[PDB]
């Protein structure tokens with residue numbers, strides 16, 4: 001689903017009014033949820049999110 | 053005296069900023085039940 005959504009959107013050239021800026025999007029990757037603790041990364045669980 | 057979650061360790065922390073378990077990384081603590089007499093009617 002996400003790959004089709006990102007592939008469908010096409011970014012055209014950006015011109016304020018020579019130099020021009022164009023952007024593009026590659027493969028979309030999603031990582032597993034992880035809690036960003038102060039000490040180190042920890043496993044994230046649904047009940048941890050519910051309690052916190 | 054407070055009990056941590058997945059890790060077994062007594063917190064015993066009463067400071068306001070102390071919410072994270074010592075020698076641990078999780079911030080979930082359970083209050084421990086002391087030895088107190090409670091009367092119930094059957």
Ligand SMILES: [Zn+2]
Nearest residue numbers: 056059073076
């Ligand atoms: Zn702990």
